[PDB]
From Swiss-Prot, chain A:
GO terms for biological process: proteasome-mediated ubiquitin-dependent protein catabolic process; regulation of protein catabolic process; ubiquitin-dependent protein catabolic process. The keyword Repeat applies. One of its GO terms (molecular function) is enzyme regulator activity. Belongs to the proteasome subunit S2 family. It comes from Saccharomyces cerevisiae (strain ATCC 204508 / S288c). Residues 13-25 have a biased composition (Low complexity). Residues 4-25 are annotated as: Disordered. GO terms for cellular component: cytoplasm; endoplasmic reticulum; nucleus; proteasome complex; proteasome regulatory particle, base subcomplex; proteasome storage granule. This is 26S proteasome regulatory subunit RPN1. PC repeats lie at residues 251-283, 284-321, 322-356, 357-397, 400-432, 502-533, 534-568. Acts as a regulatory subunit of the 26S proteasome which is involved in the ATP-dependent degradation of ubiquitinated proteins.
Swiss-Prot record, chain B:
SUPFAM superfamilies: P-loop containing nucleoside triphosphate hydrolases. Interacts with UBR1 and CIC1. One of its GO terms (biological process) is positive regulation of protein catabolic process. The gene is RPT1. The modification Phosphoserine is found at S67, S134. PROSITE patterns: AAA. Keywords: ATP-binding, Cytoplasm, Nucleotide-binding, Nucleus, Phosphoprotein, Proteasome. Pfam families: AAA (PF00004), AAA_lid_3 (PF17862), PRS7_OB (PF21236). This is 26S proteasome regulatory subunit 7 homolog.
Curated annotation (Swiss-Prot), chain C:
GO terms for cellular component: cytoplasm; nucleus; proteasome complex; proteasome regulatory particle, base subcomplex. It comes from Saccharomyces cerevisiae (strain ATCC 204508 / S288c). Coiled coil: none annotated. This is 26S proteasome regulatory subunit 4 homolog. GO terms for biological process: nonfunctional rRNA decay; peptide catabolic process; positive regulation of protein catabolic process; proteasome regulatory particle assembly; proteasome-mediated ubiquitin-dependent protein catabolic process; protein-containing complex localization; ubiquitin-dependent protein catabolic process. Belongs to the AAA ATPase family. The 26S proteasome is involved in the ATP-dependent degradation of ubiquitinated proteins. The regulatory (or ATPase) complex confers ATP dependency and substrate specificity to the 26S complex. Has ATPase activity. It is found in: Cytoplasm; Nucleus. GO terms for molecular function: ATP binding; ATP hydrolysis activity; proteasome-activating activity. It comes from the Eukaryota.
Length: 695, 359, 363
């Protein structure tokens, strides 16, 4: 009762990692007379080996300060096994807050099971790095580094990368220079790019004659040659490049960026078109560099992408349109004060003919995602309510409210700037944002007020984002949520409509369900023809790379649209074009082996949802067709020995019969034994102490 | 649209409920499943007054009148179970039985589970394939093919795909009628369904009328032969008066399927209607081998296996037991974690059928 | 309450002058019936359970596509007109229908049956969880499952354990109730089983304790029935007509399959045959650990002591031994069963409480 009364008013969640504080400052939790109670049962159960009943006593009183007293010396393995089936769920409800004090005393041990529980649920930054704290072996940290590349989230920006990635000698850091390039898609995508040179197929590309037909073939030149390096059409014959002007020239050089994409250098290759004469021929240069830099953030051996900060703000119309879209993709996961400083006046004035700020809002959430920035939410807050300079259009103002949705993640107490934007202008999607800001404000979710606030909003479309995290972490709120999910799918906006099958398609590889695909019948026809335009594209994006199979129920949804008019041909072919994405062979994986989802990849999915205007109605520029190359993840599985070195090891092959470093494979199970945190795909195996083997 | 259809009860339905109910219910009384009249005096000519309910049955005398369009008042007019006098021209033939009828013209089925059944095809070659191809040959022979053809064998095997294989060579129309679905709450559904089969067989020459599960109908049953209602009792009339008397033997043919011959009416088993009795045997070593090689095209296997040794270890089996060998072959591959079924998987699938059944 | 007052409440406030009054036009005197034939003339045939067959008209509520023949609809008392459509659950579909959500039994509580757990998973749970194994092989997983043994052990625990991991509702259908000894009720109750589980495929069909439809004999007497011949033969068409990816399975239990119709069997539709196996040493150990967790054991009671002398009783019978050991503790008025109680319990359970005696001399 002393904690529950103080649990409603506080700046954080339950639990603390400080074992030397009496909790007498501010809100009082443990009184002074409870000092003897903490040590009361300590000498008893230790000598009697009564830890079975001793743990159950700490679960009743919920005292986190008693945990380090029982763990002192002798066997540390037996006390961890009693924390598996007991500590996480004693009662019908579930309290995971007891892991806060477990980080300090188990710092040198932790557990194989507890390490997974720390990476999920609350998901604190210090909890994800606890896997490197318990083990001092730099070899064991290697296998944990490859899963960190697909992890992103907490540790992304220069706080770890670009600093420790040059190698370090210490206890729980141990990040070598190999883990810098090899774990992330930097060197492996370059070796993968060289693999497509001998794997190339027949190319239909040509130079044709007129520039009108070159624009139609420019999209094919970048789509067919994606991943393959071709110097014949670039250096030799420029007829399909120089003859195009305006939006055609930007889309022409944009195909060059996809040709050189996933290479060690994506800048100096395009410097030929960087400065020629007009801003029209200079526009596609900055766009292709960012497309070619997709997959790498801080560079391989050098931070080469930091030199593009001066290319952001340009008074030219064509360059500024291709600079924000191209550089916003390459700068993802890396925070910069100079890049943000030049993006503040662009998004403030929202000047279409000069600054081209239409895509500047989505770039702010795509770049700084996963980082900690308090100046980006404050500067926009003043420009959101006042709307200074020439800012007029309200849709671009609403785009800022959706742009800040990703910005307050991991900001802690800085989420108050988002609350001021909700009370300023009322938006349909901002009503549920004010509730979910407490996830990163309290450094976790699942509290008492957090659950009650969700039941008040439901009994709108954005509230289901935090419910799914609590439903998986709480069985009580999961049953009442499943009944609410059915009635929420009917709403004016399609946000609640399109997100339900998206989350189902992610887990469709494990537990497929056709009940969601039946409700989509109403999703196809709503009011106007613009509803059916994004309906086929949404059903085709989640079904990219799969022919029927578990999508057979979804096939009946797209069967209602075959041939209607000339404009309907472009609408029905949206799903057909996505089936061939990745030269016809692609496997989309938005998650990892940690039983969580990658929010950096999901951030690019929401960016393309608001974007991609050129395939939809009201086509503006032809440079938006290349946005699909941003969310494409490199498909490979690296073969490693017990030491994690790039050497050929004979094991079960993946999805391509020879497994080596740089070979394309995905979705392969691993039944063998590893060091810690056993994962599929890229894995470092070991051998029992009896013998020495790499399998 | 939602609020538009709500107030139609006070405006449009007032006329609809008056003409569709009050006129039909007038005097304690357009698909018609029911008709009733109570104390109607009309001057022999358009008298009607027929109660379709089994209680208080009526008749119509004093001459004969034919009015297929409108008998008396229109509205409620029915026949249902008992046919009375001049009420014949307007039978209540409406029923959602379209799900029961299956009509396939020139089936494409050749050999799937029927591989090796050519022995039974030769039994159906003379009395079925020959008249449906060159019926003029029987003019010089002096005789004609018998009316019906009886099928016999294991239950649920050989009565489905084997009948469509003969229709391929003759390019005939295969119509399968399930006998268990002929029995419904409507009395006379079995007899009325057989009526429409001969009507469609007269328009198009060389058609095959197949009756599936005749044991559920037969020539007589408890509710008809031993009962007062007429459904199967009137079904036998359509197989005698129509087929034998009016319908020529060359163009129109009839075939049944049954587990036992004694389950039918001994009146039908007599010569003149049901003559040819086709017994379904089991495929031999060559027949069982051609079935496995066809199923191996849709199932991933090893290119170096042999389908002849697979069918050799397995004894004579039905059409289903042979398909079980291929389906179970993939189950043993799951234990070994293989994408294709090797030769050892088929050997274990045969032993699973031999040991698991022992029939 | 707060969100719905500012959102859903004002939606009906503007329509309060219409939606409130226009819904009262139907009235309080309304009835229910079953559809027969639907046409575009706004007239149909409705039948109430009292069989008042009438030819009525159709009011405008929903389009004719949403009116399905054979489903319960909302009717009127006097005019018997069709004012709308209702849910089909009012149809007397199956005589005994029970949907059990979240079954209690699982694979860990059934003992040493893991040899049969991986085998039953392939025919039921595997195509539900991972159909791609059968999809890459281009084959259809077996829909049916044949059970043997005794009830409570192999005919019960094995049925409720597979429904737990599949996260499907347990649907029990009595086998003896499938035959009403009436013409037309046999195929009717069989088609309604796949209808309730065939919409979203939420559950799995389970059938247990068949002493009746399994044996038709030769005649309606001597334990068999004539309606069994038509019911089993027509049920085969429902097995082949039903097609899915394995979200719905059919598990039937019978003592002997020799009396079954080889047509309804149709090998390749049912690839799963579960034979009763004798419990091993690990079976009793898993049953004891559940009850001995809440039951305090003395210092002379160990795991290898209780399994030393055993007849290989099933997982259920071992539970009866733990209850008898606790019954002797109530005689001495204590909550901790000592080792002296198990010695007298094993003699009473396997002899007095279960009469076997193991008749010898080659028998």
């Amino acid at each position: 009762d002393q904690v529950e009364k103080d649990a409603e008013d506080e700046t954080s969640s339950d639990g603390s990692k400080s074992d030397g504080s009496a909790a007498t400052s501010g809100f009082e939790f443990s009184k002074e007379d409870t000092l003897r109670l903490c040590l009361d049962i300590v000498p008893y159960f230790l000598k009697h080996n009564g830890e079975e009943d001793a743990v159950d006593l700490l679960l009743e009183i919920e005292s986190i300060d008693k945990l380090p007293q029982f763990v002192d010396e002798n066997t540390f393995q037996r006390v961890c096994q009693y924390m598996v089936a007991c500590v996480p769920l004693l009662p019908p409800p579930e309290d995971v807050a007891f892991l806060k004090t477990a980080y300090s005393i188990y710092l040198s041990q932790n557990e194989l099971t507890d390490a997974i529980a720390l990476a999920v649920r609350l998901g604190e930054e210090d909890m994800i790095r606890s896997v490197f704290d318990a083990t001092s072996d730099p070899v064991m940290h290697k296998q944990l580094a490859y899963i960190l590349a697909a992890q992103k989230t907490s540790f992304e920006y220069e706080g770890v990368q670009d600093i420790i990635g040059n190698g370090k000698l210490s206890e729980h850091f141990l990040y070598l220079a190999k883990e810098l390039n090899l774990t992330g898609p930097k060197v492996p995508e370059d070796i993968y790019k060289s693999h497509l040179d001998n794997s190339k197929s027949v190319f239909s590309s040509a130079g044709l004659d007129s520039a009108q037909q070159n624009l139609a073939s420019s999209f094919v030149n970048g789509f067919l040659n994606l991943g393959y390096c071709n110097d014949k059409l670039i250096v030799d014959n420029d007829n399909w490049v120089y003859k195009t002007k305006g939006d055609g020239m930007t889309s022409a050089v944009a195909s060059i960026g996809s040709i050189y994409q996933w290479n060690l250098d994506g800048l100096q290759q395009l410097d030929k078109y960087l400065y020629v004469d007009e801003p029209e021929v200079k526009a596609g240069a900055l766009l292709g560099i960012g497309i070619s830099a997709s997959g790498v953030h801080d560079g391989e051996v050098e931070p080469a992408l930091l030199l593009l900060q001066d290319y952001v703000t340009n008074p030219d119309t064509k360059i500024s349109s291709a600079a924000i879209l191209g550089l916003g993709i390459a700068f993802a996961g890396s925070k910069n004060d100079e890049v943000l400083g030049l993006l503040l006046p662009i998004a403030a004035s929202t000047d279409l003919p000069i600054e081209t700020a239409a895509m500047a809002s989505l770039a702010l959430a795509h770049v700084f995602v996963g980082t900690c920035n308090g100046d980006i939410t404050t500067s926009i807050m003043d420009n959101f309510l006042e709307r200074t300079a020439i800012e007029l259009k309200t849709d671009w103002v609403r785009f800022l409210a959706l742009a800040l949705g990703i910005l307050y993640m991991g900001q802690g107490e800085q989420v108050d700037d988002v609350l001021e934007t909700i009370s300023a202008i009322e938006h349909p999607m901002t009503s549920a944002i004010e509730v979910l800001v407490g996830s990163c404000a309290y450094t976790g979710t699942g509290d008492v007020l957090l659950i009650q606030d969700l039941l008040h909003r439901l009994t709108l479309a954005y509230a289901v984002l935090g419910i799914a995290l609590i439903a998986l972490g709480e069985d009580i709120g999961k049953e009442m949520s499943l009944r609410h999910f059915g009635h929420l799918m009917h709403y004016g906006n399609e946000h609640i409509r399109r997100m339900v099958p998206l989350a189902m398609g992610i887990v469709s590889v494990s537990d497929p369900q056709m009940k969601v695909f039946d409700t989509l019948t109403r999703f196809s026809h709503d009011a106007d023809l613009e509803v059916s335009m994004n309906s086929i594209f949404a059903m085709g994006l989640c079904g990219a790379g799969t022919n029927n199979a578990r999508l057979a129920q979804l096939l009946r949804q797209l069967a209602s649209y075959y041939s209607r008019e000339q404009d309907a041909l472009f609408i029905t072919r949206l799903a057909q074009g996505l089936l061939h994405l990745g030269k016809g062979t692609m496997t989309m994986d938005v998650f990892n082996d940690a039983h969580v989802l990658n929010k950096v990849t999901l951030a690019s999915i929401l960016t393309t949802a608001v974007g991609l205007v050129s395939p939809s109605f009201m086509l503006k520029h032809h440079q938006l067709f290349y946005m699909l190359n941003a969310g494409i993840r490199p498909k490979f599985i690296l073969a490693l020995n017990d030491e994690g070195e790039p050497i050929k090891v004979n094991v079960r092959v993946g999805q391509p019969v020879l497994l080596n470093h740089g070979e394309r494979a995905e979705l392969e199970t691993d039944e063998y034994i590893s060091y810690t945190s056993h994962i599929e795909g890229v894995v470092i195996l070991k051998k029992n102490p009896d013998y020495r083997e790499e399998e | 649209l939602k609020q538009t259809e709500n107030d139609l009860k006070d405006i449009e339905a007032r006329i609809k409920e008056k003409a569709g109910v009050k006129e039909s219910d007038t005097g304690l009384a357009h698909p018609l499943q029911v008709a009733r009249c109570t104390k109607i005096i009309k001057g022999e000519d358009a008298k009607y007054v027929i109660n379709l309910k089994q209680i208080a049955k009526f008749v119509v005398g004093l001459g004969e009148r034919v009015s297929p369009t409108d008998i008396e008042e229109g509205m409620r007019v029915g026949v249902d179970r008992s046919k009375y006098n001049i009420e014949l021209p307007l039978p209540p033939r409406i029923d959602p039985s379209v799900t029961m009828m299956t009509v396939e013209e020139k089936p494409d089925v050749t050999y799937s589970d029927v591989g090796g059944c050519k022995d039974q095809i030769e039994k159906l070659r003379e009395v079925v394939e020959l008249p449906l191809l060159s019926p003029e040959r029987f003019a010089t022979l002096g005789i004609d093919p018998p009316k019906g053809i009886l099928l016999y064998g294991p239950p649920g095997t050989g009565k489905t795909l084997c009948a469509r294989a003969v229709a391929n060579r003759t390019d005939a129309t295969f119509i399968r009628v399930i006998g268990s679905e002929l029995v419904q709450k409507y009395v006379g559904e079995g007899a009325r369904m057989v009526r429409e089969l001969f009507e469609m067989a007269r328009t198009k020459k060389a058609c095959i009328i197949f009756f599936d599960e005749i044991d559920a109908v037969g020539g007589a049953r408890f509710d008809d032969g031993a009962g007062g209602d007429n459904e199967v009792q009137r079904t036998m009339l359509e197989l005698i008066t129509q087929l034998d008397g009016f319908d020529p033997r060359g163009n129109i043919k009839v075939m049944f399927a049954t587990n036992r011959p004694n389950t039918l009416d001994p009146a039908l088993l007599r010569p003149g209607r049901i003559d040819r009795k086709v017994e379904f045997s089991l495929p031999d070593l060559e027949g069982r081998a051609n079935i496995f090689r066809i199923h191996s095209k849709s199932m991933s296997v090893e290119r170096g296996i042999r389908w002849e040794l697979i069918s050799r270890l397995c004894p004579n089996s039905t059409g289903a037991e042979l398909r079980s060998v291929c389906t179970e072959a993939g189950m043993f591959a799951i234990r070994a974690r293989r994408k294709v079924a090797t030769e050892k998987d088929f050997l274990k699938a045969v032993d699973k059928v031999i040991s698991g059944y022992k029939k | 309450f707060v969100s719905n007052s500012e959102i859903l409440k004002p939606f009906e406030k503007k329509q309060e002058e219409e939606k409130k009054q226009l819904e009262e036009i139907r009235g309080n005197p309304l009835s229910i019936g079953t559809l027969e034939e639907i046409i575009d003339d706004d007239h149909a045939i409705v039948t109430s359970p009292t069989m008042p067959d009438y030819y009525v008209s159709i009011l405008s509520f929903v389009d004719k596509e949403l009116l399905e023949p054979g489903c319960s609809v909302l009717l009127h008392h006097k005019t018997m007109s069709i004012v709308g459509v209702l849910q089909d659950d009012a149809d007397p579909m199956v005589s005994v229908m029970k949907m059990d959500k979240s079954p209690t039994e699982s694979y860990s509580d059934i003992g040493g049956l893991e040899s049969q757990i991986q085998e039953i998973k392939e025919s039921v749970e595997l195509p539900l969880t991972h159909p791609e194994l059968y999809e890459e092989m281009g084959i259809k997983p077996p829909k049916g499952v044949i059970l043997y043994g005794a009830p409570g052990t192999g005919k019960t625990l094995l049925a409720k354990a597979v429904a737990n991991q599949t996260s499907a509702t347990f649907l029990r259908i009595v086998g003896s109730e499938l035959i009403q000894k009436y013409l037309g009720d046999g195929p009717r109750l069989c088609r309604q089983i796949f209808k309730v589980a065939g919409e979203n495929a939420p559950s799995i069909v389970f059938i247990d304790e068949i002493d009746a439809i399994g044996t038709k004999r030769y005649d309606s007497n001597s334990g068999g029935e004539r309606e069994i011949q038509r019911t089993m033969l027509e049920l085969l068409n429902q097995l082949d007509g039903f097609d899915d990816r394995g979200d719905v399975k059919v598990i039937m239990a019978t003592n002997k399959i020799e009396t079954l119709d080889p047509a309804l069997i149709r090998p390749g539709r049912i690839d799963r045959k579960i034979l009763f196996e004798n419990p091993d040493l690990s079976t009793k150990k898993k049953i004891l650990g559940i009850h001995t967790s809440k039951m305090n054991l003395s210092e002379d009671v160990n795991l290898e002591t209780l399994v030393t002398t055993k007849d290989d009783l099933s997982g259920a019978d071992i539970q009866a031994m733990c209850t008898e050991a606790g019954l002797l503790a109530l005689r001495e008025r204590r909550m901790q069963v000592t080792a002296e109680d198990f010695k007298q319990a094993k003699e009473r359970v396997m002899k007095n409480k279960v009469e076997e005696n193991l008749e010898g001399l080659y028998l």
